[PDB]
Design a protein around this nucleic acid. Structure first.
Ligand code: SF4
Ligand SMILES: [Zn+2]
Length: 414
DNA sequence: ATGAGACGGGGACT
DNA sequence: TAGTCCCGTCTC
């Protein structure tokens, strides 16, 4: 309902004015140097400016700034314009994305650029609503980031950083993933975003959550919005010797509930921590088959995953899925290897060790093998088989799991 | 037809 | 050391 207590609202316009001014003044003296800020500040063309912002905001989804920087630079140097990206192949996109994770982001970014160039004359949509509707991979966050940063639209955003900042600043301790709490956070973000500098405000709020209002041990003594933070105000009471008026059980007859407030956590009582369920275990066997090749050998066999599901369309060493009880077997692996190599001397199969790779939702254990051939396969290389030099593999569209497998193969090789 | 699960990898910190 | 948290979009 609209009957939330003023304890969780900014009912005083003076507080809103001060929140914006304090945050932006801190940003103007503390802001990190980032390549997408540099490209954006100097690109007067709106479409080129939005493209540079769009790429960075897709790469930043569930990925830390420190990781993105090098990928962003590589991407913008290879595809400086929408037009360049639209002509790229998905295979080239996966090559550049290799190691960044959540690979559908890269595919959708290319699909979007192709749509913009080939259906919209190269012109990016100019509001959060139309960016979200028309561009694949662009949800509510990315659309608001592009619109505010690139087009000066007055629209607030809630990423993980802003969620944490707002839950402390207004002492929201309920499950933040619920529809009700999420709606309240977006409403706060829309109230607070500076109408004159909405992009800088959004960037400032996110960088505050990244560098000051951090998940653990936040730097409250260094915070520009300290005086306006409910979380901070409460910690400074402690053994008190301002609170939420409507936080009383409607029932005055039941046992009176007690506060789950943990004094030893301070402002980190907010937000509530998401309870995490461990990933399911899966098992696979994989083999680096090698042949001597010519100059720059040996060559290793790579094959392409299905274009759906996990790590879709990426390349990998031939692999088979195994049930736990049969995770050390060779039968199915050798059958898969012979698909791509013809008849194989199965005596050469060398067990190297195991590689455990953690996805967000799967703990995958590979039994890793190698099979070194004395010469090329007897038959011509089948369609879908790629024989790569070590350097080509390192630059190919492969998952990090397969790079760990390759590093195990390189170590055990003599 | 909505909401939990699918979907990668690593940085920071204990 | 080994463990933990957490940096959005889409669907099946
Ligand atoms: S005072 Fe502390 S808890 Fe509040 S916003 Fe600043 S860093 Fe976060
Ligand atoms: Zn309350």
């Amino acid at each position: 309902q609209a009957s939330v207590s003023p304890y969780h609202l900014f009912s005083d316009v003076a507080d809103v004015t001060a929140f914006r001014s304090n945050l932006l003044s801190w940003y103007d003296q503390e802001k990190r140097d980032l390549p997408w800020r540099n490209l954006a500040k100097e690109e007067a063309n709106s479409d080129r400016r939005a493209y540079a912002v769009w790429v960075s905001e897709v790469m930043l989804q569930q990925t830390q700034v420190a990781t993105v920087i090098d990928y962003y630079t590589r991407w913008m140097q290879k595809w400086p314009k929408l037009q360049d990206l639209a002509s790229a192949s998905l295979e080239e996109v996966n090559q550049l994305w290799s190691g960044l994770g959540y690979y559908s982001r890269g595919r959708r970014l290319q699909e979007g650029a192709r749509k913009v160039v080939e259906e919209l004359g190269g012109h990016m949509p100019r509001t959060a609503e139309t960016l979200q509707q028309l561009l694949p991979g662009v949800g509510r966050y990315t659309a608001g980031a592009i619109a505010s940063i690139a087009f000066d639209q007055v629209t607030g955003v809630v990423d993980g950083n802003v969620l944490r900042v707002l839950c402390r600043v207004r002492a929201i301790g309920a499950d933040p993933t619920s529809t009700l709490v999420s709606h309240h956070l977006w409403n706060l973000a829309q109230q607070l975003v500076d109408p004159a500098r909405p992009g800088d405000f959004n960037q400032a709020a996110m960088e505050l959550g990244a560098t000051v209002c951090t998940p653990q041990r936040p730097l409250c003594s260094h915070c520009p919005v300290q005086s306006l933070c409910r979380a901070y105000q409460r910690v400074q009471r402690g053994q008190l010797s301002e609170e939420c008026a409507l936080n009383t059980r409607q029932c005055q007859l039941c046992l009176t509930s007690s506060s789950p407030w943990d004094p030893s956590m301070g402002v980190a009582n907010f937000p509530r921590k998401a309870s995490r369920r461990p990933p399911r275990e899966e098992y696979s066997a994989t083999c680096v088959v090698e042949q001597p090749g010519a100059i720059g050998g040996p060559l290793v066999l790579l094959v392409q995953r299905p274009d759906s599901g996990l790590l879709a369309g990426l390349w990998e060493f031939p692999s088979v899925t195994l049930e736990p009880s049969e995770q050390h077997q060779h039968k199915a692996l050798l059958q898969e290897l012979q698909r791509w190599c013809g008849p194989l001397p199965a005596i050469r199969l060398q067990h190297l060790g195991e590689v455990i790779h953690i996805f967000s939702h799967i703990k995958l254990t590979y039994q890793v093998y190698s099979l070194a051939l004395d010469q090329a396969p007897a038959s011509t290389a089948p369609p879908g088989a790629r024989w790569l030099t070590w350097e080509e593999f390192c630059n190919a569209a492969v998952s990090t799991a397969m790079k760990k497998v390759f590093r195990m193969y390189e170590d055990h090789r003599q």
